[PDB]
Amino acid sequence: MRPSLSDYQHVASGKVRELYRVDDEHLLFVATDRISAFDFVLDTPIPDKGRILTAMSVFFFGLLTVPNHLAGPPDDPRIPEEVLGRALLVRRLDMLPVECVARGYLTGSGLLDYQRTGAVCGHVLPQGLGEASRLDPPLFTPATKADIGEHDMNVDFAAVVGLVGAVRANQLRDETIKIYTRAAAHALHKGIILADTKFEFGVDIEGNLVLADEVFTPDSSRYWDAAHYQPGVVQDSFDKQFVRNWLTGPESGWDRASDTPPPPLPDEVAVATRERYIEAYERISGLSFSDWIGP
């Protein structure tokens, strides 16, 4: 008999994820079906999104050779029935307070920083880059969490040194770029560009660096369709473009510039979005989502 979720103590909530204490050395890392667009958690869940993203993260953890915080299999008996397939048993770590971001392509706040200053997180870039320009080598563009509801703040390497130590900062930079490079090459071979990604790491009892959180989901990474990669324009979000187009289209009745909470999504848009998640997962993993565990 699997325990109830109510047997565990809630310790943290994010926009679409939850964290529970299992015992002194283990946590339960829970993905929900909530989706975020335009910095709003939308009213409408995407069915199976939590399970699909958990499956994705597990696949990429298995692909990468680096130590990670997984502490049991996806069907570990400590996982409650209610969250089966969308929750993982993980080791409790001392988390390092750095959002470790790699960018293979220039977009979002990286592009904006570049357009304002010619530099991103201390990296002075070549002239003449623009939206969705390829960056080679990939850039380490660390950030720190800001206040509630606020965007992460881009920082330079010196800031990372000040947060975690000089040797550790070097390690975060090197591992972030190595891990991103491996995953991005794998995805591209399968027809998906991972344009960028965000990692968190923690440290175990021995002082060892351990990859934590979730890895290479479409929430932690910009997924693009490689077959439509066109430098110089904004690339479609592989997973979220239907949602974005509907919300800013004529049928939603919503004005994005108003910054009022957006309306619920059509069921059809939610189902189409689920399909995009499954497509991305199956193309990258070579597995069938119908084989992924659930309640």
Ligand SMILES: N#Cc1c(N)ncnc1-c1cnn(CCN2CCOCC2)c1
């Ligand atoms: N992963 C991990 C982890 C760990 N293995 N040990 C200790 N702490 C953490 C931890 C603490 N906060 N967060 C991020 C934010 N949470 C994420 C999801 O739930 C919402 C909040 C990660």
